[PDB]
Amino acid sequence: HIIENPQYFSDACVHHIKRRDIVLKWELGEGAFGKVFLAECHNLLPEQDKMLVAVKALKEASESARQDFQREAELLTMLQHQHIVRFFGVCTEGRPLLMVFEYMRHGDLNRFLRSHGPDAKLLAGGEDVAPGPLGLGQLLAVASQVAAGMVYLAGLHFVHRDLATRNCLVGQGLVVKIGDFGMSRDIYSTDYYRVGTMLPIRWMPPESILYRKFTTESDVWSFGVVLWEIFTYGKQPWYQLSNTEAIDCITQGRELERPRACPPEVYAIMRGCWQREPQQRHSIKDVHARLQALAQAPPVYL
Ligand SMILES: Cc1cc(C(=O)NC(C)(C)C)cc(C#Cc2ccc3c4c(oc3c2)C(C)(C)c2cc(NS(C)(=O)=O)ccc2C4=O)n1
Asked: Where does the chain bind ATP?
């Protein structure tokens, strides 16, 4: 293989994990192009010679696929922060290619929210969470932490483009962190519009649908929808409507209704996120600060 293009040396110090140090216990989740496993990982952290981790096994077929894998591994090494799920490294030794993340006890935020909702067919609960509905303060803490993660991404001129509760993870003590899923889980497929391309239509603003534009202000719109998700306990936006009908709502300026468990003060934040003009939307810092204020002193609501 010979060099015939500009070569950029500069790179992220991506941590490589030996495959022998990863011990797969069992499958946690599955998608069309990947699996998530629970695993024990040796020699990863000090004085914690053994620890539980979430291991993504990704089916990267082409050379282009493995380039995307390396590109992503590079970005996640750079983007490490407090409300972003912790990425420990990769295993490109053999096949499949693995990405190692921290174990988040309660899984993704959508499934978590659904399991604590009023319409939950079974009660989910543990040592850290009470079965059934969460507190208003707990709901605000969740949103506030997600917002905090978005502040950091916006600071680095970085757009998620698929900000939704399904891509947020929930750990012990109800610590919420932003992650992502490229594996196309069969559980969250109706959340994406398919033609020929996969678009999270119901979470996307007018400018993305109409003009194909995505900025940090588009993530603010998407966060407003996450806020709606949280206060409906993981219900799908426009759940009655089809993908095209939902596109009609967003492009005609028809907004999501105030949830049953949502105070007007919290709905005002959502409405602020859903301004048609991106420049007219509140900054993610301003949204975060307002959520954090409300989390310290939750409003009274019936
Ligand atoms: C490419 C990529 C980018 C990023 C990322 O930061 N992007 C930015 C920086 C935000 C843009 C993040 C990621 C990831 C990840 C990740 C990390 C941990 C987990 C876990 C799970 O899924 C996970 C995914 C599932 C949901 C599968 C799980 C289910 C359980 N189910 S249960 C209660 O036991 O029934 C238990 C635990 C977990 C779990 O820990 N990937």
From this structure: 28-36, 56
Among protein residues, the one whose CA lies closest to atom 36 of ligand 1: 107
- Residue pair 233/116 in contact by the 8 Å Cβ criterion: yes
The set of residues, in sequence order, having a beta carbon less than 8 Å from that of 87 and lying 6+ positions away, is: 76, 77, 80, 99, 100, 101
Using the structure block, give the residue that is written with the tokens 């398919």: 194
3-state helix, strand, coil in the chain (%, to 5): 35, 15, 45
Ligand 1 within 6 A of CB of 79 = yes
Q: Give the nearest ligand 1 atom to 112 CA.
A: 33
Taking alpha carbons only, the member of 71, 66, 44 closest to residue 55 is: 44
Tell me, using a 6 A CB cutoff, whether residue 108 lines ligand 1.
yes
Angle formed by the axes of helices 136-155 and 284-296, nearest 10°: 150
Q: How many residues does the chain have?
A: 302
The rounded distance, in Å, linking the Cα atoms of 285 and 87 is: 24
Say how far apart CA 220 and CA 275 lie, in whole Å.
10
User: Does 1.10.340.30 match the CATH number of domain 104-302?
Assistant: no
Report yes or no: 298 and 137 within 8 Å, Cβ to Cβ: yes
Q: Phi and psi at residue 77, in whole multiples of 5°?
A: -70, -40
Residue with CA closest to ligand 1 atom 27: 29
- Report the nearest atom of ligand 1 relative to the CA of 72: 1
217 annotated to bind ligand: no
CATH superfamily of domain region 1-103: Phosphorylase Kinase; domain 1 (3.30.200.20)
CA-nearest residue, atom 18 of ligand 1: 54
Is 219 one of the catalytic residues? no
Q: Is 135 annotated as a binding residue?
A: no
